[PDB]
Amino acid sequence: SRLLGFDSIPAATTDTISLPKGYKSSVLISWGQPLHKNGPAFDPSGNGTAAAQEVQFGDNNDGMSLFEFPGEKNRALMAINNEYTNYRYLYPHGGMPQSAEDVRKALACEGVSVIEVQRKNGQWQFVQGSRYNRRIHGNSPLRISGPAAGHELMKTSADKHGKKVLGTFQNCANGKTPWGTYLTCEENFTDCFGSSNAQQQFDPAQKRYGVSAASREINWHPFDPRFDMAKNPNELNRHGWVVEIDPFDPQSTPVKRTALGRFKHENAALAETDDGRAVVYMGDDERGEFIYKFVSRDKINHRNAKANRDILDHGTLYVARFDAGDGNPDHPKGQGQWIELTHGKNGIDASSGFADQAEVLIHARLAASVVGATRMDRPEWIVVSPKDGQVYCTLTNNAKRGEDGQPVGGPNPREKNVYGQILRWRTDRDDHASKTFAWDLFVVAGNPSVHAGTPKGGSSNITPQNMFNSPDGLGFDKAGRLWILTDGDSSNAGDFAGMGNNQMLCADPATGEIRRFMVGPIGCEVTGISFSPDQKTLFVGIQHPGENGGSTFPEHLPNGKPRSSVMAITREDGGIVGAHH
């Protein structure tokens, strides 16, 4: 291959970072790092306060973007998501929150960490004390904008006007706009809500989004009533959005962009129509949910960044339908289309339960079911090639594929899918404004050591050497290499025998060739990817090392506490990461 400059590494089970010959890794920043001058040191005992956590790097770092600093090649800003927390390590008691301060501490872990990084002797390092350093967390004051701002469904007793919301949490992955802003995506936000009424009767929209009275083992609602559906049911509507942040303005108020719809947002991939309007491809990460596309009303003003202030408030939301494909067992190919989610179109009207467009966006999942969107195997990250504009989407797995309502077909070709696949599409005429596209399965993950000669063995670009499961994250570099990050079963046993710990692989989109590049430590997932502008440093996140108690990464102190970290990968020779030596 022209693009793959390293040899595929073996799978690993060690509590370390494994890389190819000639590569090195360094910890850029870890959960708990104070961001400001004289800030509170990380306390490995768990006794750190919620107020200190609000000024420290958040937990479980996930999607991230790097922004070049105008006029200074040795500076950059990074906006890094903090998705959730690990109660076994957050609290001294190691269990569920026991107080309002414990709840505040968990909310402080989540959100976004904006940091400055500087280079000295080729090595990028965190700059504690930079004026750009900032935490945006679960209790931060945010604004709501777009078509659902101010709607009755967005009003609560604490916010009677439906335009001011506390926090962004469950921040999964990201987007980077061409107007210098950062998009952060609220994914499993519903897990945080419960009810003080164990017999609460949830309405169809609440049930579709998966809320329950017990919460999904988060248990904030007994201490903070904002999360108690018996008292503040509309608070559920004020989360599950894409949030826009300006990393260069530390006093700016982040904005929830309701025009992009409400669902369990994984990431937000940017592209542009041939007539210059912004496009945002978005996955809803839940078994049997959909893939969405937002197209702005107005043209992007590339040379006047602030003229795009509210470009994401006006536009059109679509959802995908994919056909059955050609039935190819290895490389199925087909067509699909984008179906508009607008009140008064495609059967979305009062006869199907939608009074206005705000309700269509707040309950986008329901409107998408009305129009006949294709139920997918858990869409996670979406990326757009900078070389040819083709779009790539992980479909991480779907243990329920084949049950009633989720038939096997087209881009979801296997029942009880434990491995996942990567879906690709090419917008017609290579114009992102097109309502139709051609699709193919770029890779169908599998285990040819266990299941050779069967669908569970994967596609022919999968071998026992490079095999992996549950692709989640994706990233392109400027050369056109496609980086694949995994969040799968790390047991290295049964269906996952020989896959080892979670990992990162590199692929050539034009040939389908995939090589394993990095293996992460015990209990982690590999998530978050960004490159330095010169492409000589690849930044990648190690999330929840030791989720089940088997790691001390990265400090490796005796009976130590593992910490999610952002790693800086470089070549010892100083060349471009992934390229030939």
Ligand X SMILES: Nc1ncnc2c1ncn2[C@@H]1O[C@H](COP(=O)(O)OP(=O)(O)CP(=O)(O)O)[C@@H](O)[C@H]1O
Q: Which residues bind ligand X (CB under 6 A)?
A: 172, 187-188, 216, 285-286, 378, 396, 472, 487
Q: Which is nearer to Cl ion, 86 or 267 (CB)?
A: 86
Q: Is residue 26 classed exposed, middle or buried when 0-12, 13-18 and 19+ CB atoms within 10 A define those classes?
A: middle
Does position 489 bind Cl ion by CB under 5 A? no
Q: State the binding partner of 188 from Cl ion, ligand X, Ca ion, none, CB within 5 to 8 A by kind.
A: ligand X
Residues 6+ apart with CB under 8 A from 67: 76, 77, 78, 79, 176, 180, 182, 247, 248
Give the nearest residue (CB) to Ca ion.
Answer: 487
Q: State the binding partner of 523 from ligand X, Cl ion, Ca ion, none, CB within 5 to 8 A by kind.
A: Cl ion
**Rounded-to-10 torsion of CA 125, 128, 129, 131:** 60
Q: Which is nearer to Cl ion, 137 or 321 (CB)?
A: 321
**In Å, what is the CA distance from 448 to each residue of 40, 154, 351, 444?**
49, 50, 50, 11
DSSP assignment letter at 71: T
Q: Which is nearer to Ca ion, 284 or 380 (CB)?
A: 380
Q: Which is nearer to ligand X, 156 or 190 (CB)?
A: 190
Question: Which residue shows structure tokens 């959802």?
Answer: 319
Q: State the binding partner of 377 from Ca ion, ligand X, Cl ion, none, CB within 5 to 8 A by kind.
A: none
Q: Which is nearer to Ca ion, 130 or 396 (CB)?
A: 396
Q: Quote the least distance from Cβ 236 to ligand X, whole Å.
A: 16
From the list 211-219, 475-483, 495-503, 547-555, the region that binds Cl ion by CB under 5 A is 547-555
Q: Do 361 and 355 contact (CB within 8 A), yes or no?
A: no
Q: Which is nearer to ligand X, 214 or 452 (CB)?
A: 214
Q: Quote the least distance from Cβ 375 to Cl ion, whole Å.
A: 13
DSSP string, 357-400: HHHHHHTHHHHHHHHTPPPEE-EEEEEE-TTT--EEEEE--BTT
Residues 6+ apart with CB under 8 A from 529: 64, 473, 474, 475, 483, 485, 504, 538, 539, 540, 541
Q: State the binding partner of 286 from ligand X, Ca ion, Cl ion, none, CB within 5 to 8 A by kind.
A: ligand X
Q: Which is nearer to Cl ion, 86 or 466 (CB)?
A: 86
Q: Quote the least distance from Cβ 527 to Ca ion, whole Å.
A: 6
Does position 523 bind Cl ion by CB under 5 A? yes
Does position 58 bind Cl ion by CB under 5 A? no
Q: Is residue 275 classed exposed, middle or buried when 0-12, 13-18 and 19+ CB atoms within 10 A define those classes?
A: exposed
β-pair type (255-257, 141-145)? parallel
Q: Which is nearer to ligand X, 272 or 487 (CB)?
A: 487
Does position 337 bind Cl ion by CB under 5 A? yes
The single-letter code of the amino acid at 308 is N
Closest alpha carbon to 410 in 331, 338, 325: 325
Count CB atoms within 10 A of the CB of residue 557.
9
Does position 102 bind Ca ion by CB under 5 A? no
Does position 59 bind Ca ion by CB under 5 A? no
Residues 6+ apart with CB under 8 A from 407: none
Give the nearest residue (CB) to Cl ion.
Answer: 523
Q: Do 480 and 531 contact (CB within 8 A), yes or no?
A: no
Q: List the interface residues with Ca ion, window 448-477 (CB under 5 A).
A: 472
Site for Cl ion (CB under 5 A): which residue of 546, 554, 562, 578?
546
Does position 550 bind Cl ion by CB under 5 A? yes
Does position 284 bind Ca ion by CB under 5 A? no
- Structure token pair of residue 437: 């596209």
Q: State the binding partner of 513 from ligand X, Cl ion, Ca ion, none, CB within 5 to 8 A by kind.
A: none
Q: List the interface residues with Ca ion, window 483-542 (CB under 5 A).
A: 487, 525
What residues line the site for Cl ion (CB under 5 A)?
Answer: 321, 323, 336-337, 522-523, 546, 548, 550
What residues line the site for Ca ion (CB under 5 A)?
Answer: 380, 472, 487, 525
